[PDB]
Amino acid sequence: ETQSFVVSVAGSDRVGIVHDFSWALKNISANVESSRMACLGGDFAMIVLVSLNAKDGKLIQSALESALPGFQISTRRASSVVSPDTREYELYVEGPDSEGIVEAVTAVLAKKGANIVELETETLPAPFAGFTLFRMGSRVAFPFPLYQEVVTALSRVEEEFGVDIDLEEVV
Amino acid sequence: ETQSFVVSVAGSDRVGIVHDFSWALKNISANVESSRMACLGGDFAMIVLVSLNAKDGKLIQSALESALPGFQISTRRASHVSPDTREYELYVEGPDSEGIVEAVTAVLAKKGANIVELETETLPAPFAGFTLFRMGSRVAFPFPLYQEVVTALSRVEEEFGVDIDLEEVV
């Protein structure tokens, strides 16, 4: 019987991490069901759903610790256990950078019980002094009846922080 | 006298993690420069570049440990790519099999390409005997390597019966 495991890997970035990881799993006949990997600022992070014909993940954990010495690695059984009215939405924010934008946008999302599925932010200083552009792109999930009140709350953020925010349902 | 710090957070996914993190940073007057998240199977991972007028990350680390009990957190000081470096979108699609990711990544690592973004998925057909594999990635390497990378990836297309596209980013 095939079982699913969730594996997290984090450490300092270098060439060949994904390869070493993949080689190790292939070696133990584990299959990658899905993966998401993010690298930034010299760090590496990846989450993988791994299938194995085995009851626990001790083999996965050991194989990966051997292949990726120094890396922070965890392996656990995949979860058993949202509202059928949950929908996903693409969220985009752009405007002048400031200390409070990220906290302000995410406060709205947290308060309305939205889960963040994907997120990236960047800042791009202008060619001239005194301006840094902030961009955020995100996928979030919440019950669709809350859409209008989320939008209304995000409009306050737009006003207070001078940003443009778009929220569009994924179809 | 503001310096950059790279911060890594990993733990169980739940509502409010990014908010709890960003409030903690705002409270110590630290600014988010950029961030990337991964979320899958109930696990959460995020890397953030943070600006702070500090010589070390002790305040960042402490503030985050307090804001995010149970999470694995690391903070350190952070810092060029060549004129001829280009980024490329790499896409792979075909019947799933155990060796595809290892084969593709073997090529990239042997050629010294950096993987910047990567995601894979498998999509079982409604009927037995078929599962589609898809991979999307952004990679970077010096453009003179392009043809040898493509040639090497063509051997992977042959071995695994997958379609591989590699296109320079605009």
Side-chain angles (χ1 to χ4, degrees), chain A residues 97-114:
Chain A
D97 189 42
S98 70
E99 190 185 326
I101 318 162
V102 182
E103 191 280 336
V105 173
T106 62
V108 169
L109 295 174
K111 274 195 209 183
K112 301 284 155 54

Side-chain angles (χ1 to χ4, degrees), chain A:
Chain A
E1 182 171 304
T2 182
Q3 307 290 342
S4 177
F5 299 88
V6 194
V7 174
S8 284
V9 177
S12 305
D13 194 35
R14 61 154 173 88
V15 167
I17 300 166
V18 183
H19 179 249
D20 289 347
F21 180 96
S22 297
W23 185 92
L25 294 194
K26 185 186 180 164
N27 188 53
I28 60 169
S29 305
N31 192 54
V32 172
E33 171 180 351
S34 56
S35 62
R36 292 189 167 181
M37 177 250 72
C39 276
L40 183 72
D43 274 0
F44 170 104
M46 180 166 70
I47 305 168
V48 186
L49 293 169
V50 171
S51 293
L52 183 66
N53 283 20
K55 213 85 194 175
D56 82 34
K58 280 170 163 37
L59 182 57
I60 296 159
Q61 179 74 25
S62 287
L64 292 183
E65 289 186 18
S66 175
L68 297 174
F71 283 77
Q72 168 184 287
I73 298 162
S74 67
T75 302
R76 63 173 177 88
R77 235 345 224 80
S79 304
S80 60
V81 63
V82 300
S83 170
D85 310 334
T86 298
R87 294 298 181 276
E88 297 191 332
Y89 297 85
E90 289 289 341
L91 169 71
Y92 309 97
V93 181
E94 182 174 311
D97 189 42
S98 70
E99 190 185 326
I101 318 162
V102 182
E103 191 280 336
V105 173
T106 62
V108 169
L109 295 174
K111 274 195 209 183
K112 301 284 155 54
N115 192 64
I116 303 176
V117 185
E118 313 174 8
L119 168 73
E120 55 185 329
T121 73
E122 60 176 346
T123 48
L124 311 146
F128 46 81
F131 191 97
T132 292
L133 186 69
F134 167 83
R135 286 207 207 115
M136 170 177 148
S138 195
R139 193 178 186 109
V140 303
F142 58 80
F144 69 79
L146 305 185
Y147 177 73
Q148 188 47 60
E149 75 193 57
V150 172
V151 162
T152 292
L154 291 173
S155 81
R156 292 183 76 91
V157 178
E158 280 187 328
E159 295 299 328
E160 190 186 331
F161 287 89
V163 292
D164 286 292
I165 299 170
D166 296 314
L167 187 69
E168 299 281 305
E169 187 179 27
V170 174
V171 173

Side-chain angles (χ1 to χ4, degrees), chain B residues 10-170:
Chain B
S12 299
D13 192 34
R14 55 161 175 82
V15 170
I17 302 170
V18 180
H19 181 255
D20 299 340
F21 178 95
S22 62
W23 191 96
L25 293 193
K26 187 182 186 292
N27 180 70
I28 60 170
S29 291
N31 298 322
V32 171
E33 301 179 280
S34 50
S35 61
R36 285 194 169 127
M37 197 205 259
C39 178
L40 187 63
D43 275 9
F44 171 95
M46 177 167 62
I47 303 173
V48 181
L49 273 164
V50 174
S51 285
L52 183 64
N53 174 198
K55 300 210 175 296
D56 67 37
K58 296 188 185 163
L59 180 58
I60 295 179
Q61 184 69 25
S62 297
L64 292 183
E65 285 190 17
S66 179
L68 297 172
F71 282 76
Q72 293 199 304
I73 298 157
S74 68
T75 304
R76 71 173 188 286
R77 186 69 173 258
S79 40
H80 174 76
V81 292
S82 72
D84 73 355
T85 296
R86 294 289 180 283
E87 297 194 335
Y88 297 86
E89 291 288 331
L90 170 63
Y91 186 72
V92 181
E93 182 171 307
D96 192 40
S97 71
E98 206 180 287
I100 302 167
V101 175
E102 192 282 334
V104 173
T105 62
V107 169
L108 300 172
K110 195 152 192 174
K111 295 307 170 172
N114 304 283
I115 307 183
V116 177
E117 298 169 25
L118 185 137
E119 82 168 61
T120 72
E121 62 182 343
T122 47
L123 306 168
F127 42 82
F130 194 94
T131 291
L132 189 73
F133 170 85
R134 291 188 189 149
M135 162 174 154
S137 184
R138 184 168 292 210
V139 303
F141 57 83
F143 76 77
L145 291 191
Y146 178 74
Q147 190 48 58
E148 64 192 82
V149 171
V150 166
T151 296
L153 292 171
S154 79
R155 299 185 48 180
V156 179
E157 290 187 307
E158 168 167 8
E159 183 179 2
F160 293 92
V162 298
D163 259 279
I164 296 181
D165 292 281
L166 186 71
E167 285 154 1
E168 193 184 317
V169 166
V170 301

